[PDB]
Amino acid sequence: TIKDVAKRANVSTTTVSHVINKTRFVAEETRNAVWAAIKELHYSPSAVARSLKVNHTKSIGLLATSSEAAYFAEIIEAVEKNCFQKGYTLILGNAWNNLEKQRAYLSMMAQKRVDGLLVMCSEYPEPLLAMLEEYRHIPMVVMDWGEAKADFTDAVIDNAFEGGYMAGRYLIERGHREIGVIPGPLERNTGAGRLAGFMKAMEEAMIKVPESWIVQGDFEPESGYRAMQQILSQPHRPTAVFCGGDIMAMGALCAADEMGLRVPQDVSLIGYDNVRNARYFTPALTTIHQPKDSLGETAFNMLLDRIVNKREEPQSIEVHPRLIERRSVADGPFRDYR
Amino acid sequence: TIKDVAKRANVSTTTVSHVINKTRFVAEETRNAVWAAIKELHYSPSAVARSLKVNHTKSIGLLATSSEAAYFAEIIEAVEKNCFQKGYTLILGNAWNNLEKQRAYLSMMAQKRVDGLLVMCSEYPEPLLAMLEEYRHIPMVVMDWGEAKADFTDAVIDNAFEGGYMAGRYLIERGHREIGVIPGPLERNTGAGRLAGFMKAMEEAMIKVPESWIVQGDFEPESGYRAMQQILSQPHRPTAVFCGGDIMAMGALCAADEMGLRVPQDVSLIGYDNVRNARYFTPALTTIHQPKDSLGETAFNMLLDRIVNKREEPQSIEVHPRLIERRSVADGPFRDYR
DNA sequence: TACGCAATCGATTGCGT
DNA sequence: TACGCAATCGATTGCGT
Numbered sequence: 001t002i003k004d005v006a007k008r009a010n011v012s013t014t015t016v017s018h019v020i021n022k023t024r025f026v027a028e029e030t031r032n033a034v035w036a037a038i039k040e041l042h043y044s045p046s047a048v049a050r051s052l053k054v055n056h057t058k059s060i061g062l063l064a065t066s067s068e069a070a071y072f073a074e075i076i077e078a079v080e081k082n083c084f085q086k087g088y089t090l091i092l093g094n095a096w097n098n099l100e101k102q103r104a105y106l107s108m109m110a111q112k113r114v115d116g117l118l119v120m121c122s123e124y125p126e127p128l129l130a131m132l133e134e135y136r137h138i139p140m141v142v143m144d145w146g147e148a149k150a151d152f153t154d155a156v157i158d159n160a161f162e163g164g165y166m167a168g169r170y171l172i173e174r175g176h177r178e179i180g181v182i183p184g185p186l187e188r189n190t191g192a193g194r195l196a197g198f199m200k201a202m203e204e205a206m207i208k209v210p211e212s213w214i215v216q217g218d219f220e221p222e223s224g225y226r227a228m229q230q231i232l233s234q235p236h237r238p239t240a241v242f243c244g245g246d247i248m249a250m251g252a253l254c255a256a257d258e259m260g261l262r263v264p265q266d267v268s269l270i271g272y273d274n275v276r277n278a279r280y281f282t283p284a285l286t287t288i289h290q291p292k293d294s295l296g297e298t299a300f301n302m303l304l305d306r307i308v309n310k311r312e313e314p315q316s317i318e319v320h321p322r323l324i325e326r327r328s329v330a331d332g333p334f335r336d337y338r
Numbered sequence: 339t340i341k342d343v344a345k346r347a348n349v350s351t352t353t354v355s356h357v358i359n360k361t362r363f364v365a366e367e368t369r370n371a372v373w374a375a376i377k378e379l380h381y382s383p384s385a386v387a388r389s390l391k392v393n394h395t396k397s398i399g400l401l402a403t404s405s406e407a408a409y410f411a412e413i414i415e416a417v418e419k420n421c422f423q424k425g426y427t428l429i430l431g432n433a434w435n436n437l438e439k440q441r442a443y444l445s446m447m448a449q450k451r452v453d454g455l456l457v458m459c460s461e462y463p464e465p466l467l468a469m470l471e472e473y474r475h476i477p478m479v480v481m482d483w484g485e486a487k488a489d490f491t492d493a494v495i496d497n498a499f500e501g502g503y504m505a506g507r508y509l510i511e512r513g514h515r516e517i518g519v520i521p522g523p524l525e526r527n528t529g530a531g532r533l534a535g536f537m538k539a540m541e542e543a544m545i546k547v548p549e550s551w552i553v554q555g556d557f558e559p560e561s562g563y564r565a566m567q568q569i570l571s572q573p574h575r576p577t578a579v580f581c582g583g584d585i586m587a588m589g590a591l592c593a594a595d596e597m598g599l600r601v602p603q604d605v606s607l608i609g610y611d612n613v614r615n616a617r618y619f620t621p622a623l624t625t626i627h628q629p630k631d632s633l634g635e636t637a638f639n640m641l642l643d644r645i646v647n648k649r650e651e652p653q654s655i656e657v658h659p660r661l662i663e664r665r666s667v668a669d670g671p672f673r674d675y676r
Numbered sequence: 677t678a679c680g681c682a683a684t685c686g687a688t689t690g691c692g693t
Numbered sequence: 694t695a696c697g698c699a700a701t702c703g704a705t706t707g708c709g710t
């Protein structure tokens with residue numbers, strides 16, 4: 001088809017090319033003629049032909065976990081923004097935390113020869129770790145670790161620990177001493193990390209959280225429900241609860257409200273993520289806000305760097321969470337005694 | 339690189355090829371040798387080289403509006419599922435309801451030569467309509483119209499009208515006669531369509547909704563807030579409100595709760611979408627459920643059809659909404675008089 | 677029997693004139 | 694000056710032997 005244009009415009013295709021990419025000077029008329037032909041033939045040059053020659057497809061692969069989850073969703077849209085903004089195309093793939101699915105996705109990506117890879121798999125067993133290395137040749141950045149687990153990738157790090165710590169303290173400083181927690185999967189950073197940060201703050205306070213008061217969630221609203229329910233279901237109940245993520249949090253609000261418990265008057269609840277619509281939770285949710293957009297953009301940027309500036313040494317950028325006060329938290333019994 | 343494999347295995351590349359795609363019989367040993375080389379060289383065959391020859395990239399383009407919105411998000415994940423399931427790769431692009439962005443996205447897609455196109459642009463002005471036709475050559479299906487607006491595409495249709503109608507009736511049959519509505523953008527199907535279905539039911543009932551009682555939303559929680567607020571802010575207030583989408587609905591719950599209004603005891607609220615986490619709204623939201631997954635899959639399927647079975651005649655499949663009773667609705671003053 | 681030769685898909689780009 | 698020739702990127706596939 002490029003031959004077709006050339007022919008119409010009676011010039012070599014080489015010409016057609018250069019004019020199409022202003023890659024060397026071309027006589028006005030000549031230029032015009034080509035643009036003309038280009039238009040009548042209704043010409044769209046093949047990127048694949050081009051990619052074949054130039055050796056990069058101007059496309060990036062996002063090997064994600066799930067894309068419906070608010071948290072996820074939000075990050076993704078960000079990344080997309082950035083890609084578009086710099087001419088990259090997004091290939092979205094969800095491995096659902098399934099090795100086989102992930103091996104598959106990975107392979108198609110290499111095959112389609114994505115310029116770089118954005119990795120957000122949530123959990124990282126050695127088998128997953130291993131696979132990834134097999135493709136160290138393709139530039140990648142993991143956006144979901146607590147610290148850098150490998151030498152062959154870039155990494156953006158969220159400080160989940162300090163975020164949890166922030167959550168504990170607030171509660172502490174607000175009058176609370178009987179607290180409970182519903183964490184996300186321990187096999188994840190946003191799970192374990194948050195918990196542990198939250199647990200340090202407690203030890204520092206000589207606060208002991210009885211095990212009947214800690215209940216694992218899976219970042220899903222339903223899990224949030226069940227936990228809150230198992231917590232308030234007990235003889236002795238905490239006066240405040242720290243919930244690992246806003247959506248399970250939202251799940252937690254439901255239950256309370258269902259047993260006729262009051263928020264925050266009967267229970268204060270503090271979340272984690274500051275998801276786009278947390279403010280509209282009821283009550284408006286107080287939570288730790290995670291920089292999702294920066295989290296996206298920042299990742300894209302390291303990728304581009306390696307890609308263009310051909311860096312080879314893995315890097316790692318940290319990002320920081322921060323408390324957002326809404327109305328799901330109330331003074332605790334010890335506020336006055338501080 | 340295919341030459342590299344061949345050489346290692348001392349066979350023509352033609353061989354390497356056939357064994358790689360079991361496209362003709364090959365001596366075991368021969369086969370083995372190639373697999374061997376394939377492994378040592380750590381070989382991944384280029385899809386782009388391949389695509390160049392075979393003429394289809396096994397990739398599909400989703401020209402969407404926004405991907406963070408719950409409704410959207412949910413559909414997208416679906417589509418992705420389907421693509422993966424049949425070896426297609428997803429290129430996600432969000433035009434934000436911006437012509438220029440959409441022209442751009444469209445063009446890159448043609449260029450990257452996507453096998454087909456999934457279209458979800460929300461609003462369709464002639465300029466957008468026009469652009470689309472320009473690419474009638476690439477197979478596409480619009481997943482967001484009320485009826486088929488063009489002869490060059492397939493279309494999946496949701497019955498937003500009958501959905502709205504269902505919403506009105508329920509309210510009617512539940513004792514209500516003073517109702518208000520906060521619709522989404524009229525420039526959209528899920529906006530206008532829902533409204534009108536909802537408005538028919540009302541006329542049929544000889545119910546008149548005073549204009550101070552209808553307030554436009556933009557499908558976003560914030561909009562939901564403001565509207566509900568403007569509605570309950572009045573001297574005379576409805577006893578029931580129909581909200582165009584679950585997220586604005588959620589927005590509506592906030593406000594009420596903020597002015598100390600009760601749901602559903604002071605106001606019944608019925609939504610639209612049955613978004614994944616509507617049940618965990620508080621109270622659990624009664625709403626019309628839209629078949630998102632079928633909406634996805636069904637679209638993918640028409641695409642594949644045109645694609646593979648090389649159909650040429652546009653088709654159109656309808657899908658159906660259905661009421662889901664939760665707890666945001668209460669009997670109205672006229673329930674007993676029916 | 678089981679395999680290979682050579683042309684081809686659509687672009688780009690180094691030498692030249 | 695302003696443009697063109699021919700080789701090339703990595704695969705596939707129709708004829709043959």
Ligand code: HPA
Pocket residue numbers: 069071072122184188190191219245273
């Ligand atoms: O893995 C996760 N899933 C959903 N929401 C989350 N918020 C933090 N981590 C997660």
Ligand code: HPA
Pocket residue numbers: 407409410460522526528529557583611
């Ligand atoms: O355009 C829309 N946006 C968000 N949610 C929606 N639910 C139906 N239509 C829409």
